[PDB]
Amino acid sequence: QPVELNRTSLYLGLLLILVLALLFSSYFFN
Amino acid sequence: GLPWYRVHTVLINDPGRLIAAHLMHTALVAGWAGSMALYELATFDPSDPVLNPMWRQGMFVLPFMARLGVTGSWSGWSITGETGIDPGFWSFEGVALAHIVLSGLLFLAACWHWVYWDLELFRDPRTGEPALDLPKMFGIHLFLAGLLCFGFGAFHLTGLFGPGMWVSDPYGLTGSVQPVAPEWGPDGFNPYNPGGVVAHHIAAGIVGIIAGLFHILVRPPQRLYKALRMGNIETVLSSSIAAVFFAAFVVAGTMWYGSATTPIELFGPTRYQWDSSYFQQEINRRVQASLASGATLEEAWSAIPEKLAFYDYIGNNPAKGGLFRTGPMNKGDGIAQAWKGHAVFRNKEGEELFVRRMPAFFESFPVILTDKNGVVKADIPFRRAESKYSFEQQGVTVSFYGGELNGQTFTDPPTVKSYARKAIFGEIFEFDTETLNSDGIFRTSPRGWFTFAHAVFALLFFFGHIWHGARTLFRDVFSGIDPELSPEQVEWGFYQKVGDVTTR
Amino acid sequence: METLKITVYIVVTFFVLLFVFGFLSGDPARNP
Amino acid sequence: SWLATSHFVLAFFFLVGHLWHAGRARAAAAGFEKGIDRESEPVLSMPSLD
Amino acid sequence: TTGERPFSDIITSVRYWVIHSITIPALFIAGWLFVSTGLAYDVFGTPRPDSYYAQEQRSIPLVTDRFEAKQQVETFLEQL
Amino acid sequence: SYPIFTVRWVAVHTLAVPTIFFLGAIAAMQFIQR
Amino acid sequence: VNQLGLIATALFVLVPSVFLIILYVQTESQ
Amino acid sequence: METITYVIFACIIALFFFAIFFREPPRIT
Amino acid sequence: GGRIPLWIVATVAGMGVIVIVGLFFYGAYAGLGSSL
Amino acid sequence: RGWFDILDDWLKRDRFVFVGWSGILLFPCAYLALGGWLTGTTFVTSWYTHGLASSYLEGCNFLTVAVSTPANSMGHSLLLLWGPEAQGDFTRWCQLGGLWTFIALHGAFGLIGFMLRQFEIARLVGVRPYNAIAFSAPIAVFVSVFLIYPLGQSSWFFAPSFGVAAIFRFLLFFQGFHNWTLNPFHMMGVAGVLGGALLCAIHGATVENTLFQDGEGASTFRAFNPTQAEETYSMVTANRFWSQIFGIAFSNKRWLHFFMLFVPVTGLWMSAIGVVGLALNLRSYDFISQEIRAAEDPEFETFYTKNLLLNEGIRAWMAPQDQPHENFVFPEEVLPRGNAL
Amino acid sequence: DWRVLVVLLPVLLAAGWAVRNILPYAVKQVQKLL
Amino acid sequence: ARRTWLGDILRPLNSEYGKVAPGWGTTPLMAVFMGLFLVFLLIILEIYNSTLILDGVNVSWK
Amino acid sequence: TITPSLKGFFIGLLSGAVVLGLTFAVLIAISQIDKVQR
Amino acid sequence: AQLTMIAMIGIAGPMIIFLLAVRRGNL
């Protein structure tokens, strides 16, 4: 079965990750 | 196509490729346990289990191997204190290598079950569809679980054919691996009694064997099969996720509260052994048992073990680190080289002052020296101008008994105040802040980290139980509700019973 | 400072006169 | 304190009430305060963006 | 639309207020006599305004025990 | 033509009978002298 | 800081970012 | 290493620029 | 049934509320918890 | 048609308030907890657990009443009324914090019963159980904070108490002791709650200002009968409004309303993970790299080190009163104080 | 105890005079269900 | 479809799908084991908790 | 013998079965009276 | 008393509305 990931889901899922890592980088560097 | 979060749902109507995806998960888990223990061997300093044991080094899976008999290395070191031992094959290396060898073997098995998904064993003979008899599968696996619950309890844990388990004295000084006999009375439900842990596995193994035999030969009711949708394997998922979060809640508690399964020589002191001053009461119980023999204070304190006074130190409390204060406990205070001794604080009156020990809540804590009658006699002041109870004003000296500084007395109030800010932490220890760049910022033990993962997993698996139970009971409707859902179906008082079209 | 003050002052009033004139230049007219 | 805070509570709501009534009275003078006409919806007569 | 009498029809019926002009004030009076006759201070152990402290003593009567804790409260109450 | 003692009667009264009792009790507290 | 403080974030940005871009190029291409 | 990691924010602006101007458009259907 | 006008019930039950909360707000200033 | 089928009929009978099978577990336990809150906030003191006034009988108002937690000496005792601490005595049981565990456990069981109700009603009305899935976020907040957080701490005493000012204690406790603002899991909760409240306000006002004119009156709420199958608002205009105002817009009304389910529920689930960490005192209290910087440089001040100075203020000024069991006797000179205050 | 006989005496006077007015209206509803 | 050797030895162990036992079945025998587990877990809950204190059961390391 | 918190657990578990069992005794009773017409 | 003022001040608001209801006036 093929995986569909439309461009909005690339855009939100990149938004989900980048603002997660903008959050947690302050704590991963600590 | 499939959404990205639905990509694994190509295995529901594929039991052979469900077994392969499972074999690969089990290969990755067994591969991690081999990889984690080999990395733990590469960083474990084993030459001092008194002041630098496995829970000070952030050894995660080294205590889980230790608590079931695995005690030595091919290098030569045993964790119990000896060197030069030949523990045979089952070392920390051989256990880890067995887990990597298992992981390659479960890998190739997963490779086989992925290509050869189309076995007739999954295909139902009466309808040609790939079908799993989940009631009969359950009783088969419940029989195997109880066979391996009984045999682990009645051979491994009893020691009759097996090593036993890690047993301890209550203060964790001479704890080792011993065979444990089963406790069959009511004292076996004491979680700190290890005889119940043996007797659980013997008894629950038999009951699991008995129930495993039951679910093989007894079929589900027509109304229990359909309430749970026992034909679907999402109901096995939702009730197994329900089990593993209950079980992860239990191991979060029994790690945090402590049990016989989670000893303090392996996972560290609990936070409740610092709350009660549980080691401080024991330390003073030994000292007064020599203060009535006639043995003087320098003598009566040089007999306290360094391992016992190390448990009475707040940098071993697991409620004292932080979520991103990462790494071993030795990354915090340091590597404990020796006990500095019991700091006895006396004023210029020569009357003994007792430091208010810090609770595990506090990052900062004021240094405050009460007496036996409770009234505050000295403190390190914040505002020092209008002060009355400073160490300089009240003439506070510090004397050390046992440890490094046995028979030393510091009277000059800067050196008394430095030792006073370390006496709010319990017993004062000399730390190596040079081996691994120990910045003083307190860390968490393997007892505290395990509780964090397994109570956050258990909460995250509470949602997964809810989600997959939602998917089971509502399987017809997760594409959506009916377009032909009648307005008179959800209208009030069109049916005498909600949900039923024969009650209008 | 002497120069950037009147630089900002002209920039502000040109955008503000653009604001005030364009809402005076028939903003009730510009409806569907 | 009583006079400044009461006349801030009142003056903010009177800004909200201005935004309410200025938006509405201009929607009323143009004829879509009750909603969008379905038969003559402007956006389906308005071109696409991208 | 499920079957019960509508709330526009119960509280507006006079038979409601035949019942409830003599039960709503009665329970307001019952609750008054819970506090006014002092039974509130005895069901739940909430102290009276002259029962937080002994006459000279000003300490908080705080529980320090678990299985010797019901007897500890009584020791604080016999102090009053 | 309606029932009188329904489930809703129990939902109403098990809340609103101790509510009025408590409101009489809190209103007696407003007159406790200190 | 932590010397594993960027690798904790680079493998937090890029590890799902490689995943969502792989997913997008395999569904753009149909 | 610290600030130049944090300046993740420049990827967000590029995503803010891409998801506004280069989104797959809404289609009247 | 619909004998009593519902507004009269709604204007005196709603006046039972403000009498009681007006009694509750008065006892903020009287007796216990009045800081006096 | 035996007695289980007959009890299934009467439980799922179409009435005013739906009872159901969950109502055996919801309707006593949700009512004992809320009835026990009101019983504890009216009539039960905190004079032996906390040394506090917390009932209307003592003089407290609705803000200051609480059903306070048990004492620290109780530990995580279940504090059954028949249990070894209360020994049957109801008067003693309220004094020992027994009504706190009465509310925290019946309220726990009622929240299971309400979440099971959401499953049971969705199975009968034929809809998907997403409201139960969205109710997992208030469960996980009630479970982490009122149950898991005290279970990680030394007793029930450090759980929040069921009261307005007592919750306010608990908020100010977590700033001083845990630095819970700085925790990244709480920020995902603030982003989830305020994102939810934004998506409540935005979607509410977007629908209400893109309505189709279906009635000839100037009050638009009577232009909707529910049996209609038209969109009551213009999702096309709403998408073109937000695409030019904000830049991005929903164009899928199903994805919009899933995002409304997603955003406060993921936020409240992330706050749960932080509080479970704070049960073990696993705080994001300090950035180690900055307090290394600030302890050998006495001029490097950030707002971070200012907040940590505030937390030392909270932890030393509040604790001899907040934590009476510890017998914190902090002199008038150990207290962290700035100049002139 | 005397006080619990004065907290419950308007209550037992409430429910009695409540059941003294819907007394025939209870015998009509139980009969209709049976 | 691929009829293998181990697929035949365990074919009776996957050839009873959907064979329900008729009626309510052994659900009463299960509900009275549902309940005894509930009492058993509540026993070991309350022992660990020190709510249930027993003769010779000290729930502590010592 | 039976410790005083053991008979507390008995009293609670029997009261909890008086609470549960008489709850379902009435719910069985009212369901037998108020059967839905099919 | 201050209350018997505020009672008859307060009651005689709805009694305007009571009269125009029981006289079928222009309510």
Ligand code: CLA
């Ligand atoms: C083949 C046999 C085998 C053996 C002898 C070992 C041995 C070991 N493993 Mg390994 N492991 C294995 C297979 C094996 N493993 C496989 C196949 C995997 C992949 C799934 C792993 C993954 C793994 C991990 C991730 C880890 C280990 C670890 C360990 C060590 C400690 C185990 C422990 O204390 O955990 C406790 C074990 C349990 C509590 C078993 C759970 C059983 C639960 C309680 C049953 C409850 C539900 C039950 C079905 C209900 C019905 C019961 C019924 C009777 C009534 C020990 C040396 C640890 C280690 O130290 O690594 C070096 C560790 O971290 N193993």
Ligand code: CLA
């Ligand atoms: C043993 C437990 C177990 C098993 C076998 C499954 C299996 C499944 N889940 Mg479930 N679920 C579980 C536990 C489990 N889940 C838990 C704990 C949660 C709460 C977090 C959920 C919440 C959940 C939701 C909300 C959904 C599923 C869905 C699914 C289905 C598709 C999975 C997929 O393709 O994801 C694809 C996964 C990826 C592409 C990877 C990203 C996933 C996250 C972001 C990272 C994964 C963590 C990391 C890689 C390793 C985890 C280690 C582990 C210790 C946790 C599959 C049936 C989906 C479904 O039901 O569709 C019909 C679905 O929508 N699950």
Ligand SMILES: C=Cc1c(C)c2cc3nc(c4c5[nH]c(cc6nc(cc1[nH]2)C(C)=C6CC)c(C)c5C(=O)[C@@H]4C(=O)OC)[C@@H](CCC(=O)OC/C=C(\C)CCC[C@H](C)CCC[C@H](C)CCCC(C)C)[C@@H]3C
């Ligand atoms: C303080 C915040 C807060 C309150 C008061 C609250 C209240 C409610 N939420 C409900 C629902 C929901 N809330 C939901 C998402 C959210 N809910 C949120 C936050 C709250 N939700 C947030 C932030 C989210 C976003 C994720 C969903 C998806 C639902 C529902 O479906 C449901 C609903 O339908 O709402 C309309 C209802 C619960 C009915 C019930 O379960 O009875 C059970 C009652 C019991 C068990 C008795 C209460 C006992 C509780 C647990 C502890 C005792 C508390 C005392 C009684 C009072 C103490 C008060 C002090 C703390 C001040 C009720 C309206």
Ligand SMILES: CC1=C(/C=C/C(C)=C/C=C/C(C)=C/C=C/C=C(C)/C=C/C=C(C)/C=C/C2=C(C)CCCC2(C)C)C(C)(C)CCC1
């Ligand atoms: C119905 C309703 C309701 C209720 C309400 C209420 C409750 C109200 C109240 C009301 C009221 C209660 C009113 C009153 C009014 C009054 C008035 C308006 C008055 C007037 C008076 C005057 C003007 C005076 C004068 C004088 C003087 C000045 C001096 C001389 C003498 C005299 C006294 C004459 C609600 C909203 C809830 C809801 C539903 C509807």
Ligand SMILES: [Fe+2]
């Ligand atoms: Fe909507």
